[PDB]
Design a binder for this molecule. Structure first.
Ligand SMILES: C[C@@H]1CCN(C(=O)N2CC[C@@H](S(=O)(=O)c3ccccc3)C2)C[C@@H]1N(C)c1ncnc2[nH]ccc12
Length: 277
């Protein structure tokens, strides 16, 4: 299993930077002749470290067609780097925004289903993702996506069905906003927002922050109040009613009335099969 000399990990370009960390595109190049393979490298910037070492083990334990591949780690005596496969097509968020004129609903629902299957899988390990958004989805090719970040992922406790813990508040279930509770259910609410993002094709004027801030008129509080009076993101221009209905069932205030991911992949596969024509 793959073992990495820090010394031969050559920085090529910056892929994402945050509050406490970053993702780089590096080439691992032991033969020093630039024929090494390109990888993605996650590092911390300024217990985070405990959380980072859990993340590594989570990603490692995942092996799935729609989850980004763990490659190994890279350390200094005694500046931890998590190594993953590099997917050159980049995030679905940017890829959708780019090729909207070549990506019909059939494609949209393919990605949607591959996202559910990945999430279904996470659930089999009681993993809660916590950050479901097009931002964190990668495109392997035109017909395949992978969930590409597990920064916030948690393992549920063995006797419980929720984990209590800047947050992307416009993607969050209300119980996440008010009780900091995270669950399969809250992953489902967020999935609904992913479905919303996909069918707006990332039109900046139609993003969850823009529409929610519009409907609002502490931002967080305003959001809680809005969600509680059944305010919701509108149906995207051109969205079929069955896709919007899946969204509104994901955004049910009651955790227990939200659909399962196995059910979501199913309905979504049947709606995609009914458009094939
Ligand atoms: C879309 C991907 C997931 C998201 N990622 C990103 O920008 N983030 C993940 C971590 C955070 S962070 O590092 O900014 C951060 C760290 C700590 C606290 C807070 C923030 C942002 C970009 C990735 N990307 C473009 C890639 N492109 C090609 N192949 C890839 N393989 C693996 C990733 C990847």
């Amino acid at each position: 299993p793959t073992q990495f000399e820090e010394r031969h990990l050559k920085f090529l370009q910056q892929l994402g930077k945050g509050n406490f960390g970053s993702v780089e595109m590096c080439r691992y190049d032991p033969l020093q002749d630039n024929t090494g393979e390109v990888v993605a490298v996650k590092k911390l910037q300024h217990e985070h470290l405990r959380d980072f070492e859990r993340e590594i083990e989570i990603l490692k334990s995942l092996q799935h067609d729609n989850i980004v591949k763990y490659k190994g780690v890279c350390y200094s005596a005694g500046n931890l780097k998590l190594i993953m496969e590099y997917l050159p097509y980049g995030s679905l968020r940017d890829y959708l925004q780019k090729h909207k004129e070549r990506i019909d609903h059939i494609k949209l629902l393919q990605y949607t289903s591959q996202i559910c299957k990945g999430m279904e899988y996470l659930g089999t390990k009681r993993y809660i993702h916590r950050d479901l958004a097009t931002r964190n989805i990668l495109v392997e090719n035109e017909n395949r996506v992978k969930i590409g970040d597990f920064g916030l992922t948690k393992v549920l406790p063995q006797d419980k069905e929720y984990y209590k813990v800047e947050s992307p508040i416009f993607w969050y279930a209300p119980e996440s906003l008010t009780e900091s509770k995270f669950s399969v259910a809250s992953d489902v609410w967020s999935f609904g927002v992913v479905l919303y993002e996909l069918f707006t094709y990332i039109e900046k004027s139609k993003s969850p922050p823009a529409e929610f801030m519009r409907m609002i008129g502490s931002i967080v509080t305003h959001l809680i109040e809005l969600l509680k009076n059944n305010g919701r993101l509108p149906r995207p221009d051109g969205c079929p009613d069955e896709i919007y209905m899946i969204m509104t069932e994901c955004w049910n205030n009651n955790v227990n009335q939200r659909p399962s991911f196995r059910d979501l992949a199913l309905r979504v596969d049947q709606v995609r099969d009914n458009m094939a024509g």
